[PDB]
């Protein structure tokens, strides 16, 4: 239930090797406005597949 010896910083880093995040690196450019956005997501201004969908 509790450790008998404190794990080293080496073991701590080895366990943490799998905690690294991954960049999206998949930013698409809108057909009309040419705004970078996440794939299959509306742009910040409210564009998707060229046509405006939010109108706000």
């Amino acid at each position: 239930a509790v450790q008998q010896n404190k794990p080293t910083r080496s073991k701590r880093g080895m366990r943490r090797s799998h905690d690294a995040l991954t960049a999206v690196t998949s930013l698409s450019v809108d057909k009309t406005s040419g705004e970078k956005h996440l794939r299959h997501h509306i742009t910040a201004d409210g564009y998707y597949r060229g046509r405006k969908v939010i109108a706000k």
Binding site: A20, L21, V24, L27, K36
Partner: protein
């Protein structure tokens, strides 16, 4: 050029912010900015603000042409910690550490 920029005493823990820092290390500012824009972490907006400040410092206090800038160095160091008392069961007491950190970003054109 050096054009360092740092944000000291960030409330986020050094460990948590350090994951975001490793993402953009060695990359160009243009790719770094939108990488942080679409990273779903609180540390993302802390680091992004520091990176924006570094770019502004280079543009104003140093040479222009920020298009060819890169994040040569970025590191997160543990800062002062605040000690708090949190009651537990059976009348026991334990210490809660509100860990802070310093985020330092260095950009250069070479």
């Amino acid at each position: 050029m050096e054009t360092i920029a740092k944000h000291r005493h960030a409330r986020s823990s050094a460990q948590k912010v350090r994951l975001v820092a490793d993402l953009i290390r060695g990359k160009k500012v243009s790719q770094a900015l939108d990488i942080l824009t679409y990273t779903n972490k609180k540390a993302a907006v802390l680091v992004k603000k520091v990176l924006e400040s570094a770019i502004a410092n280079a543009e104003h206090n140093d040479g222009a042409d920020i298009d060819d800038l890169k994040v040569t160095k970025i590191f997160v160091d543990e800062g002062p910690s605040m000690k708090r008392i949190m009651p537990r069961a059976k009348g026991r007491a334990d210490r809660i550490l509100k860990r802070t950190s310093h985020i330092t970003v260095v950009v250069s054109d070479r």
